[PDB]
């Protein structure tokens, strides 16, 4: 499924004209600050659901069993914990 | 003398009054009940280690840079 | 899963009134959330195509469907590497979304399922 | 014809770092493989050096990692450089694999890739397990204990392979001159599979994050690729300096630094943390062989991915439900890892099983269920 | 410029040539300039600065 | 588990090794070390330190050497093959006070007095941990905790009954410094000194690490602009699709 | 322009640079690991006595 230079495996390419310049030519940075403010933030806008529902999730989760361990090992969890085990 | 001794003084009497309290009643709590007969047969014998931890532990949050500011 | 697969069951559902009145909606709020539009793609330039018969649909679309994929790819394959999405006419409309590849590729599993059937034949 | 391309020897390089074509939009994520390679030679060049200064005999073992702190020239730096890798490795491990889980990278045509990189995993594994008893702490030795106890579940014959690994009743002097044999050796076992694995890549190339083909644009390796990989070599060594000269210890256990004593139990035996999840596993089992099964299958499940995966379209770039289903496995992952390593109290026995359920029924009901309706909602919602 | 790039940097035997023996420059530099500033961060608590005591 | 089985948790304290730039101080270092042969070397070893290894730390090449031939330490044997003893060098490592761990045990109500080598690196908390250990003994424990005989209370040792008692008091030790030698200075300067025994390289490893960060920020920056620079051509391309 | 080429060669130079200085750096650190370790230098300076020894 793939070949090499010259008989890559691509359907016949035909009608496509490719520009571009050299390296030395251009501001590798060019559009830099923009980039990095506006790109970044609608990248991570449109991301940020995916990351941010399950790790709030199971923090939560974490949370309240922490929590809850920690309250049956103290005097006031002494009836609670002996139910426990 | 020590210079702790008056930091952990000074800290228990003042932020941490109120552990400081809640460790007092424990002790006056485990001591009459230990003074009571039938104690040695007790199923529960209550301590005041939680109390005093909470207590140490907030002196500690108030001294530990004091105390080594002056050492 | 095979294309076959996918589009009988979707018959299924589209003939269903009830199942068609709840899943269409869905359906296509999936397609918008997918994105896949914002690189100018169309749903078929998805479909995985290193298998024997993706191969052999591949080679029967038409030559002019076969080099504006061709197209398709490298744009969408640029956007990527730029971190960009599509403007303007690059963004594919809904009406341009055309399964141009599902009629050839029923056609490739269609023979490839019936050999196999005949295969197994048992003279009664 | 260029020297590279016509002689045999310098035309494997080049197949491999040079002409070798490929997709021109690989993002960060495709990094991990150069970074496991350069942890894979840090661990060779301090592990063989380790060698040179230390001593296999249980007598002097933990001492002779003592004299390689303290006597012999940087033998600190090389001692914590070997050691914090070893947790390196396995992040970037499981940042490789779970690139190749959200991409799609284990479906064909690189199932084969897929299923090796699987026994390279689980090398991993075993070298790490090994070379953490040489130290002979007490962490070293009741870790050996322990997970070599394992073992004895296998049924009728259980005991006496546990006898025959340890060379012994317990785990002794037989056991750590035979892990270190071991040690040495597996590294050289996992540079092949590694490379095994690469091969058969080489035959479809790498997939690319839209998951569709790039035969129709290629790049070559050098020089995008290389400088591109020069971007996360220098980020991996600044966190490699945050560790080994500033925080050492930051990601170790300080029960080993006593030297092994099995008379003594430590107050908590848990594995590395890279092993917690499956520590976790185990311990949802309450059966000793139930648990072990649960444990190598939590692995060996990664195996059916290419199946139970019914999605005609490769990887989660344009699936949002795969997506958030992705986003809660990897956090059940997590989750797991911190279980393996609470103590055995409520409420976390019972969270433990439920977050195992989770694991497991992700492969078999979650990911075949969730890739049969995406199918359904792309070819409906484009009608 | 013209004549930067011409003697340093246009053959490539006299650009690595530059590089190394810059290399040489930095790391000598670049140690003592540490070693100073290490010694000023750090100024009283060292062994060389309590040696004379003793 | 309880609190008191874990043991209550030490404060941070401000060292002056805490902090990236930091050194030792080797004022403090040498000062613990006083206070260690004067009071922790009764029962506990350090036995990871040679004498050579004070030096140009602690102590000057004679002041080690003087403490070294101080001690004896045993030979080869003599000609007719008879045991000898020989003075200290500055090879030798720092003698233990008991042969074996059972004359440790017997002179320790049972329990051993674990070697001072590694004791910051074995414990959570590390110098932290030693130094509110030593200054953390209540004078009384609080009230319902039941101590096994032969032990004493203190919150920060697991389960809470130590075999140690108290050792530092004001001015067990004089320093040469003149120092007030409280109970808080000499654990400090002995936390300090057994920190330091545990990882002697400390100071070297932080400076080193500071050219390493130097100089890979400075790599990582231009690799930036490198791997920018080469990828432009790629970044910039552009199509114009005429389709047949 | 000139100018313009010999400024990124600048950059290559000095990341060049860099990694010579720490490639050099880094070998000779890791490779002293095998010149002789403390507890072996130590181990000189023997002291001998002569007042045994007799003539001959
Ligand atoms: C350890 C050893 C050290 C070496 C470090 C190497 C790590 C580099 C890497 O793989 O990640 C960088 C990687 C940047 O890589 P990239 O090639 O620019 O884009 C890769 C994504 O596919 C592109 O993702 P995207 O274009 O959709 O952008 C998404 C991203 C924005 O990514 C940006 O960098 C912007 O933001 C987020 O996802 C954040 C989530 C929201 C939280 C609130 O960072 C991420 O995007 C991480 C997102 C993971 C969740
Ligand atoms: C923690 C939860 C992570 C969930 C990720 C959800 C997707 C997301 O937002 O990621 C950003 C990006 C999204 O990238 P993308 O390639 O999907 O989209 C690029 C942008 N568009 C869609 C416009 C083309 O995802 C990644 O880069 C994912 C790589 C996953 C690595 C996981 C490591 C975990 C290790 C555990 C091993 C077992
Ligand atoms: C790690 C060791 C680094 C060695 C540095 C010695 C000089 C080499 C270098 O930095 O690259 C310059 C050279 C050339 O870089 P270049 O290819 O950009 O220079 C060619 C164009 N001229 C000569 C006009 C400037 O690199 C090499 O020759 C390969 C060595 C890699 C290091
Ligand atoms: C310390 C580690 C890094 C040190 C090496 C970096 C190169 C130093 C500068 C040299 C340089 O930039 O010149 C190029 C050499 O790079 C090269 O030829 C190599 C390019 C990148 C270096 C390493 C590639 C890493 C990729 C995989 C990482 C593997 C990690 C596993 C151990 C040639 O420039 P040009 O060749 O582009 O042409 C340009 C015309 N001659
Ligand atoms: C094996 C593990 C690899 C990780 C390397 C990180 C640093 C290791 C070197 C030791 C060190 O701290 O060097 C500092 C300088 O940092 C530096 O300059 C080193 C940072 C450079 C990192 C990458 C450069 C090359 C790494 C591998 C190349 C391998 C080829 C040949 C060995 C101290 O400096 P010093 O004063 O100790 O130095 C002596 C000459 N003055
Ligand atoms: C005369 C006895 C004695 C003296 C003096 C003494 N110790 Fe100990 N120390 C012990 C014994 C016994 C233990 C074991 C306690 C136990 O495990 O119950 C111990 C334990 C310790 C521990 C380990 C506690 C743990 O977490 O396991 C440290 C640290 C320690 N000592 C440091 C010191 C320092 C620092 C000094 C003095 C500056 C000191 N000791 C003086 C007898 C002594
Ligand atoms: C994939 C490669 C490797 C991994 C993941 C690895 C992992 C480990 C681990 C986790 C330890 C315990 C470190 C500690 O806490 O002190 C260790 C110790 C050791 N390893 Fe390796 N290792 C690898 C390769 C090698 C190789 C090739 C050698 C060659 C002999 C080696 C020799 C040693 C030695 C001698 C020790 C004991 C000294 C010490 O603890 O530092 N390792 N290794
Ligand atoms: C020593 C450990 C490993 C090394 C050095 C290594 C190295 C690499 C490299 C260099 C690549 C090509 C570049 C890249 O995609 O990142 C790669 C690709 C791959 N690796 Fe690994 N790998 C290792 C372990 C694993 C493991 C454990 C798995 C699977 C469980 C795995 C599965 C794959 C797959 C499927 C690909 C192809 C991904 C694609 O391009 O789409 N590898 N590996
Ligand atoms: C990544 C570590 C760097 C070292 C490289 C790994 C060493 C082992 C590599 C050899 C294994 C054989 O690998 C095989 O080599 C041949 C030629 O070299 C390659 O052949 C490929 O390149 C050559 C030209 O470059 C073409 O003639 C051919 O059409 C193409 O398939 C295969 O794609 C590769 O699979
Ligand atoms: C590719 C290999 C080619 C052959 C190269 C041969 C390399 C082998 C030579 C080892 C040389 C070590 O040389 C010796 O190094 C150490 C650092 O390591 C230096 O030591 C100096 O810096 C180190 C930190 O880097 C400090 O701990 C030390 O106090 C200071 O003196 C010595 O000043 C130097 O004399």
Redesign the pocket.
């Known amino acids: 499924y793939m070949g090499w230079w010259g008989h890559m495996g691509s359907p016949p390419q035909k009608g496509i004209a490719g520009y571009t310049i050299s390296p030395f030519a251009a501001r590798p940075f060019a559009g830099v600050v923009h980039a990095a403010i506006f790109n970044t933030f609608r990248r991570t806008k449109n991301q940020a659901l995916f990351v941010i529902l399950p790790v709030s999730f199971f923090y939560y989760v974490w949370t309240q069993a922490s929590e809850k361990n920690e309250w049956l090992y103290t005097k006031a969890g002494r009836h609670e914990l002996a139910k426990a085990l | 003398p020590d210079p702790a001794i008056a930091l952990h003084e000074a800290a228990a009497e003042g932020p941490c009054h109120d552990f400081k309290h809640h460790f007092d009643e424990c002790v006056e709590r485990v001591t009459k009940a230990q003074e009571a007969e039938d104690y040695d047969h007790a199923e529960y014998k209550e301590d005041c280690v939680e109390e005093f931890f909470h207590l140490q532990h907030c002196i500690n949050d108030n001294t530990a840079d004091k105390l080594f500011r002056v050492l | 899963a095979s294309i076959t697969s996918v589009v009988k069951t979707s018959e299924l559902i589209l003939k269903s009134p009830l199942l068609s009145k709840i899943v269409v909606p869905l359906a296509k709020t999936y397609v918008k959330f997918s994105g896949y539009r914002q690189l100018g793609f169309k749903m078929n330039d998805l479909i995985i195509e290193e298998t024997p018969n993706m191969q052999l649909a591949l080679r029967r679309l038409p030559p002019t469907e076969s080099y504006d994929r061709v197209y398709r790819l490298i744009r969408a394959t640029q956007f990527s590497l730029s971190h960009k999405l599509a403007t303007g006419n690059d963004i594919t409309k809904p009406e341009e979304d055309d399964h141009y590849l599902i009629p050839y590729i029923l056609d490739v599993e269609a023979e490839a399922f019936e050999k196999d059937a005949l295969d197994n034949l048992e003279v009664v | 014809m260029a020297l590279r391309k016509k002689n045999s020897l310098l035309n494997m390089a080049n197949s491999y770092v040079l002409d070798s074509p490929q997709p021109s939009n690989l993002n960060y994520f495709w990094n991990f493989g150069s970074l496991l390679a350069l942890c894979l030679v840090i661990q060779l060049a301090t592990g063989i050096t380790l060698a040179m200064h230390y001593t296999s005999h249980a007598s002097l073992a933990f001492d002779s990692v003592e004299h390689i702190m303290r006597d012999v020239?940087?033998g600190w730096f090389i001692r914590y450089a070997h050691a914090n890798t070893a947790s390196f490795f396995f992040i970037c491990i499981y940042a490789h694999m779970g690139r190749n889980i959200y991409y799609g990278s284990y479906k064909t045509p690189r199932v084969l890739p897929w299923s090796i990189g699987v026994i390279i995993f689980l090398l991993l594994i075993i070298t790490a397990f090994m070379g953490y008893v040489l130290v002979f702490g007490q962490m070293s030795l009741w870790g050996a204990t322990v997970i070599c106890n394992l073992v004895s579940a296998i049924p009728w014959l259980g005991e006496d392979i546990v006898h025959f690994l340890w060379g012994g009743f317990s785990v002794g002097n037989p056991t750590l001159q035979r892990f270190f044999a071991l040690h040495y050796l597996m590294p050289f076992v996992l540079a092949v599979f590694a490379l095994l694995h690469l091969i058969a890549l080489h035959t479809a190339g790498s997939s690319n994050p839209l998951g569709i083909t790039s035969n129709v644009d290629k790049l070559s390796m050098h020089p995008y690729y290389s400088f591109k990989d020069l971007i996360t070599v220098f980020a991996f060594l600044l966190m490699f300096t945050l560790f080994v000269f500033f925080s050492p210890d930051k990601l170790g256990h300080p029960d080993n630094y006593i030297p092994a004593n099995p008379m003594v139990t430590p107050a908590s035996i848990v594995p590395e943390w890279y092993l917690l999840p499956f520590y976790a596993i185990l311990r949802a089992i309450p059966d000793k062989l139930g648990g072990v099964i649960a444990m190598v299958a939590a692995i060996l499940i990664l195996l059916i991915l290419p199946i139970v995966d019914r999605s005609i379209i490769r990887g989660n770039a344009f699936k949002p439900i795969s997506k958030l289903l992705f986003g809660f496995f990897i956090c059940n992952f997590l989750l797991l890892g911190v279980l393996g390593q609470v103590h055995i109290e409520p409420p976390f026995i019972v969270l433990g099983q439920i977050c195992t359920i989770f694991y497991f029924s992700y492969f078999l009901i979650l990911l075949p269920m969730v890739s049969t309706i995406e199918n359904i909602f792309f070819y409906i919602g484009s009608l | 410029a013209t004549t930067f790039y011409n003697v340093f940097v246009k053959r490539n035997s006299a650009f690595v040539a530059t590089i190394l023996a810059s290399a040489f420059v930095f790391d000598m530099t670049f140690?003592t300039a540490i070693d100073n500033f290490w010694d000023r961060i750090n100024a009283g608590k060292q062994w060389k600065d309590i040696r004379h005591k003793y | 588990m309880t609190a008191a089985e874990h043991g209550l948790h030490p404060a941070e304290y401000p060292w002056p090794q805490n902090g990236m730039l930091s050194t030792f101080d080797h004022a403090s270092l040498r000062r613990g070390y006083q206070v260690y042969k004067e009071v922790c070397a009764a029962c506990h070893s350090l036995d990871r330190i040679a004498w050579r290894n004070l030096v140009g730390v602690t102590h000057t090449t004679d002041e080690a050497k003087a403490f070294a031939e101080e001690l004896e330490y045993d030979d080869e044997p003599d000609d007719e093959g008879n045991p000898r003893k020989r003075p200290g060098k500055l090879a030798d490592y720092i003698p233990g006070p008991y042969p074996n761990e059972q004359a440790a045990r017997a002179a320790n109500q049972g329990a051993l007095p674990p070697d001072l080598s590694l004791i910051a690196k074995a414990r959570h908390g590390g110098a932290d941990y030693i130094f509110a250990l030593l200054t953390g003994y209540p004078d009384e424990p609080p009230a319902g905790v039941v101590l096994a005989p032969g032990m004493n209370y203190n919150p920060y040792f697991p389960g809470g009954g130590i075999g140690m008692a108290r050792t530092l008091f004001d001015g067990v030790v004089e320093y040469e410094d003149g120092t007030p030698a409280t109970t808080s200075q000499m654990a400090k300067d002995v936390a300090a000194f057994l920190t330091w025994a545990a990882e002697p390289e400390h100071d070297?490893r932080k400076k080193?690490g500071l050219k390493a960060i130097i100089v890979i920020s400075a790599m990582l920056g231009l690799s930036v602009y490198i791997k920018k620079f080469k990828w432009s051509p790629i970044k910039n391309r552009k199509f114009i699709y005429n389709p047949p | 322009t000139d100018a313009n080429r010999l400024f990124s060669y600048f950059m290559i130079g000095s990341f060049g640079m860099l990694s010579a200085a720490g490639a050099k750096?880094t070998?000779?650190?890791?490779?002293?690991n095998?010149?002789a370790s403390a507890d072996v230098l130590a181990m000189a300076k023997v002291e001998v006595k002569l007042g045994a020894i007799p003539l001959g």
């Not at chain 7, 070998?27 to 002293?32: E, G, K, N």
């Open positions: 020239n940087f | 140690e | 070297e080193l | 750096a070998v000779q650190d890791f490779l002293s095998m010149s």
